[PDB]
Design a protein around this ligand. Sequence first.
Ligand code: AA0
Length: 328
Amino acid sequence: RPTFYRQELNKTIWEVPERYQNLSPVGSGAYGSVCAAFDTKTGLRVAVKKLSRPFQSIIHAKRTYRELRLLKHMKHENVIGLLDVFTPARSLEEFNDVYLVTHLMGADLKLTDDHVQFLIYQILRGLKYIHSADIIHRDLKPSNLAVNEDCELKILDFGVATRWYRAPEIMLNWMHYNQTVDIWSVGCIMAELLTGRTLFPGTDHIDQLKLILRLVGTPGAELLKKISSESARNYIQSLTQMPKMNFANVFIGANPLAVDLLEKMLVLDSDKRITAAQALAHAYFAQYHDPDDEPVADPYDQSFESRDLLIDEWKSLTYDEVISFVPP
Ligand SMILES: Cc1ccc(NC(=O)c2ccnc(N3CCOCC3)c2)cc1-n1cnc2ccc(N3CCN(C)CC3)cc2c1=O
């Protein structure tokens, strides 16, 4: 048991191991507030997140468990990993707080084409990894991507409007989806880095769809066959029909290989959209691609998602995961 010490900052008690020094508030993360700190063990800067009321209800309790399970699993250069997890509690009975420690993430995301190449390559390399364990991000956007001064990138979640980057199949719920919802988001981010402008800045779900269809065209007879929802089918067929634009005439003067890749990412049909692994092998990435250094994840059991448990049961499962943690 390490020695803990207490303090108050921003009208909240932080009780942390002596290992972590000089805590400094940096704002809110996903379901908690965050401080920067100094890790005396390595001499590096770290981010410490104290979760907000982790066990107040069933939903909070299961989302606390979800995040801890996920962070303990993800071990890859372009994805956030877990340095430490702790509680000041000495027993399950008095267990009420959870703190998660990671490396101190940098600032978030016109750029040079060489820069666009390296940043999109790193995002796809991280996505090949998470997708290989059937983990889907679902909220990829520039503010959820950390980049240091070396231009190294990690995918994370800090909890730009989300609707601007959302795949139509999960925003409107109109056909089956797969991991490629994240690929649509990547296409939207890449366009923005090439142009300096948000590609589809919609005001609501309806405006958003209107802006999308202006570029990709109204679904034809072949895609309409896969639209599960009758409401959505009627909607689509009632619009004034829009043709597909030539992307080359939209992204004027971009690298033609970039324009080709964008054409393969920004398709409405989820069965036809390029996957992360396929996109790594596209000619655009010739300078960076190495099929021997693009690893997959160990399998991830998420059978817990389908379970219906009491607050104290999620709490005991979370306690177990704190106890069983082993440092990298
Ligand atoms: C410490 C910590 C602990 C946990 C997490 N959790 C996740 O990143 C996360 C949660 C759920 N799913 C994730 N996946 C990523 C991979 O694809 C699948 C989904 C990631 C994040 C942090 N963290 C790290 N550094 C920060 C630096 C500054 C800041 N702040 C606050 C926000 N403002 C905007 C900038 C400075 C916050 C953090 C912050 O939260």
